[PDB]
């Protein structure tokens, strides 16, 4: 199973400079250039946060 | 940028053939003028930069005109296949947010209710500024709209000589065929479009005789010819298969008949696009994926696997799409952060791969 697919996993929501969001496994180190925004939580909770807050999928550098 | 490269070949060789579609033959100049005129029509009917235009046309020759016209307006192209049911077609136009649908007389029936229609069959000058991040495409797999930036398309095209010829089955909503039609035009070559039906060994032998040096074939046709006559592939510098990775036996048969031919398969989907070349494996022939100057093979903990270990393939590069339209959550789980590259993303293919002792990336 893929870490990002596992439902038993604790997850994090990361955001880069372009406003793009990524799920991240809680055990993994946060990569450089990515910032955490939503505490360790269930897969679904994180997905909910993304569907709510990542409204414009366009990179920010293009207005 | 396809438009910038195409313009060069319109300047250097305007009278060269660009498309050979059945009875229809278009030079680089003709294709440019026809697209410029249709582009002006799109601008009149309200097409602005960043807008999305749905295109549903039978013939490939028309398909290219519409494409360039959409890009000339600065808009993005949503490929719609006439075969799709109206449930699909209506949804794809709704999800993309396309205001206008471009069609032919034959396909006009498919235009959903409430969509402004322009028919290619039935002068103002604009000068638009576009950037590589702008969307060129929205490609649909309920179907998921993949937002492809102009830059991603540029990577795929980024070698052919002018007047060289590529034999291609009719472009399809499928990711493979839709992008391939560009490759010949960026180099000054010509697209030669196969009549409907499986490519046969003789058609392949006839095409190479006409000057086709490259062929983009369905997995089924490749296997058919590989069994029928491996020797028919002779004359081609590169033969490329799309769809299911062809059985290794067929590739080995074709190689014995044509030692010079390069066999590749376009396994990748629209989100992340990979061109893979068959090579003789150390043990045999196997698909090999270029690392580039990137790809990662990662375990379940997202830590890089050792050589000879199989892991899931993650792809990072300029070819990656922005994400899935109206699916932020799905984009976030598929387009995960890349530990190697700051502020970058890697796309999980869902496909297994492994590293050879030589360091070549191997599909699995």
Author numbering:
A (entry chain D): 2 to 64
B (entry chain B): 1 to 122, 129 to 147, 153 to 169, 174 to 298, 301 to 310, 316 to 386
List sentences from the manuscript.
In this work, we have sought to understand the evolutionary history of lipid II targeting glycopeptide antibiotics (GPAs), a vital class of nonribosomal peptides used in the clinic for the treatment of resistant bacterial infections and exemplified by vancomycin (Van) and teicoplanin (Tei). Since ANC1-3 domains display polydisperse elution profiles in size exclusion chromatography, we instead turned to the characterisation of an Acore construct of the Hpg accepting A1 domain from Tei biosynthesis (A1tei), which possesses a homologous pocket to ANC1. The MbtH-like domain Tcp13 also exhibits the anticipated fold, containing a 3-stranded antiparallel β-sheet and an α-helix adjoining the centre of the sheet.
